[PDB]
Design an enzyme around this catalytic site. Structure first.
Site, PDB file in Angstrom:
ATOM      1  N   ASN A  63       1.025  -1.188  -0.034  1.00  0.00           N
ATOM      2  CA  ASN A  63       0.149   0.012  -0.082  1.00  0.00           C
ATOM      3  C   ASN A  63       0.865   1.302   0.018  1.00  0.00           C
ATOM      4  O   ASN A  63       0.319   2.447   0.038  1.00  0.00           O
ATOM      5  CB  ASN A  63      -0.880  -0.029   1.146  1.00  0.00           C
ATOM      6  N   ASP A  97      -3.949   3.886   0.255  1.00  0.00           N
ATOM      7  CA  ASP A  97      -4.935   2.563   0.491  1.00  0.00           C
ATOM      8  C   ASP A  97      -5.812   2.211  -0.905  1.00  0.00           C
ATOM      9  O   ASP A  97      -6.569   2.991  -1.160  1.00  0.00           O
ATOM     10  CB  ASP A  97      -6.060   3.268   1.781  1.00  0.00           C
TER      11      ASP A  97
HETATM   12  C1  LIG Z   1       2.755   3.623 -11.219  1.00  0.00           C
HETATM   13  N1  LIG Z   1       1.923   4.256 -10.261  1.00  0.00           N
HETATM   14  C2  LIG Z   1       0.945   3.801  -9.637  1.00  0.00           C
HETATM   15  O1  LIG Z   1       0.647   2.723  -9.442  1.00  0.00           O
HETATM   16  C3  LIG Z   1       0.156   4.719  -8.999  1.00  0.00           C
HETATM   17  C4  LIG Z   1      -1.259   4.537  -8.502  1.00  0.00           C
HETATM   18  C5  LIG Z   1      -1.964   5.490  -7.778  1.00  0.00           C
HETATM   19  O2  LIG Z   1      -3.508   4.845  -7.662  1.00  0.00           O
HETATM   20  C6  LIG Z   1      -3.942   5.355  -6.372  1.00  0.00           C
HETATM   21  C7  LIG Z   1      -3.472   5.386  -5.193  1.00  0.00           C
HETATM   22  C8  LIG Z   1      -4.169   5.695  -4.109  1.00  0.00           C
HETATM   23  C9  LIG Z   1      -5.475   5.836  -4.434  1.00  0.00           C
HETATM   24  N2  LIG Z   1      -6.345   5.890  -3.143  1.00  0.00           N
HETATM   25  C10 LIG Z   1      -6.115   6.031  -1.747  1.00  0.00           C
HETATM   26  O3  LIG Z   1      -4.787   5.967  -1.622  1.00  0.00           O
HETATM   27  N3  LIG Z   1      -6.939   6.063  -0.839  1.00  0.00           N
HETATM   28  C11 LIG Z   1      -6.706   6.404   0.361  1.00  0.00           C
HETATM   29  C12 LIG Z   1      -5.779   6.785   1.005  1.00  0.00           C
HETATM   30  C13 LIG Z   1      -6.331   6.865   2.546  1.00  0.00           C
HETATM   31  C14 LIG Z   1      -5.250   7.657   3.517  1.00  0.00           C
HETATM   32  C15 LIG Z   1      -4.795   9.202   3.100  1.00  0.00           C
HETATM   33  C16 LIG Z   1      -6.292   7.886   4.702  1.00  0.00           C
HETATM   34  C17 LIG Z   1      -4.121   6.784   3.752  1.00  0.00           C
HETATM   35  N4  LIG Z   1      -7.439   6.522   2.727  1.00  0.00           N
HETATM   36  N5  LIG Z   1      -7.899   6.106   1.274  1.00  0.00           N
HETATM   37  C18 LIG Z   1      -9.079   5.741   1.158  1.00  0.00           C
HETATM   38  C19 LIG Z   1     -10.308   5.982   1.776  1.00  0.00           C
HETATM   39  C20 LIG Z   1     -11.546   5.695   1.582  1.00  0.00           C
HETATM   40  C21 LIG Z   1     -11.724   4.359   0.697  1.00  0.00           C
HETATM   41  N6  LIG Z   1     -13.010   3.867   0.531  1.00  0.00           N
HETATM   42  C22 LIG Z   1     -12.925   2.672  -0.298  1.00  0.00           C
HETATM   43  C23 LIG Z   1     -11.898   2.308  -0.859  1.00  0.00           C
HETATM   44  C24 LIG Z   1     -10.719   2.586  -0.610  1.00  0.00           C
HETATM   45  C25 LIG Z   1     -10.437   3.922   0.057  1.00  0.00           C
HETATM   46  C26 LIG Z   1      -9.504   4.420   0.402  1.00  0.00           C
HETATM   47  C27 LIG Z   1      -6.324   5.635  -5.398  1.00  0.00           C
HETATM   48  F1  LIG Z   1      -7.717   5.658  -5.510  1.00  0.00           F
HETATM   49  C28 LIG Z   1      -5.505   5.283  -6.559  1.00  0.00           C
HETATM   50  C29 LIG Z   1      -1.549   6.507  -7.635  1.00  0.00           C
HETATM   51  C30 LIG Z   1      -0.283   6.875  -7.996  1.00  0.00           C
HETATM   52  N7  LIG Z   1       0.420   5.778  -8.596  1.00  0.00           N
END
Ligand SMILES: CNC(=O)c1cc(Oc2ccc(NC(=O)Nc3cc(C(C)(C)C)nn3-c3ccc4ncccc4c3)c(F)c2)ccn1
Length: 258
Positions: A130, A143
């Site tokens: 993650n 996440d």
């Molecule tokens: C090559 N590059 C890549 O692969 C690459 C891929 C990439 O894609 C993503 C990365 C992160 C996320 N999303 C999150 O991280 N969500 C998150 C963070 C938190 C925190 C802040 C509280 C930790 N809570 N929730 C979060 C909150 C609520 C949710 N409800 C349902 C389900 C999940 C959830 C997650 C996303 F949607 C796409 C970005 C950059 N590079």
């Protein structure tokens, strides 16, 4: 001002070898800027965006925009070139990604978690799978909702609830009790992941037997080349009693004054 228009993004490939859900490489054509795009039920999807709008820290993932109450819906995130930390560690050149860089990695995650601790967020699924790696070894906590995207080799049942067993604090396994201290425990395992260049925790031990092992006071051995003081940080993170575990403020300080 978060609202974007779908057609301003060119969509390209599925991220993470296609094991990280409906998340794509895209390009914000105006800036010629690569972005990550999460695509779509909608009420969970919209609640993710809302959370991410209130997250700003250099070691946490950064919302850029959303495309809303019309399908496909997008959540558009700043792109992290090198992908997930687990696969990164596993495939890296270890002269380039040497012990200093491993330390810098851990220090970045602890800052991110210090910030989540201050905001009373509970992550609930911290692990190398993650974390994201960008340019110059920048690490960001994310996440991806992997509990719905992975298999029983990582996520499975304990006493009738689903867990990422080998990253889960004992009180969470035993009582479904989640807190910032259960995230500390997870951080412990993630520190072990970093130091082993992405080895799976409790090598060879079936997810079935992990809780009972912990309960008898077993913890994982010190990784090859890990300083004793960093190992003791893991062991601090893995105290049975969550009270005896350090805060993320405390852990970050320990890296700072090493
Ligand atoms: C090559 N590059 C890549 O692969 C690459 C891929 C990439 O894609 C993503 C990365 C992160 C996320 N999303 C999150 O991280 N969500 C998150 C963070 C938190 C925190 C802040 C509280 C930790 N809570 N929730 C979060 C909150 C609520 C949710 N409800 C349902 C389900 C999940 C959830 C997650 C996303 F949607 C796409 C970005 C950059 N590079």
């Amino acid at each position: 001002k978060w609202e974007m228009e779908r057609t301003d993004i060119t969509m390209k490939h599925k991220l993470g070898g296609g094991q990280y859900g409906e998340v794509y490489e895209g390009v914000w054509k105006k800036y010629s800027l690569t972005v990550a795009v999460k695509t779509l039920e909608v009420e969970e999807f919209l609640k993710e965006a809302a959370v991410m709008k209130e997250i700003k820290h250099p070691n946490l993932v950064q919302l850029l925009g959303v495309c809303t109450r019309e399908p496909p819906f997008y959540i558009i995130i700043e792109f992290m070139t090198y992908g997930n930390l687990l696969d990164y560690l596993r495939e890296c050149n270890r002269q380039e990604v040497n012990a200093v860089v491993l330390l810098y990695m851990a220090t970045q995650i602890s800052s991110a978690m210090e910030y989540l601790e201050k905001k009373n967020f509970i992550h609930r699924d911290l692990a190398a799978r993650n974390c994201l790696v960008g340019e110059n070894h920048l690490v960001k906590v994310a996440d991806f909702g992997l509990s719905r995207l992975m298999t029983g080799d990582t996520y499975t049942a304990h006493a009738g609830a689903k867990f990422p067993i080998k990253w889960t604090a004992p009180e969470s396994l035993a009582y479904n009790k989640f807190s910032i201290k259960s995230d500390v425990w997870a951080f412990g395992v993630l520190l072990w992941e970093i130091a082993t260049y992405g080895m799976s925790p409790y090598p060879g031990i079936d997810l079935s037997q992990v809780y009972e092992l912990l309960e008898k006071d077993y913890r994982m051995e010190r990784p090859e080349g890990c300083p004793e003081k960093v190992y003791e940080l893991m062991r601090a993170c893995w105290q049975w009693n969550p009270s005896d575990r350090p805060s993320f403020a405390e852990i970050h300080q320990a890296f700072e004054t090493m």
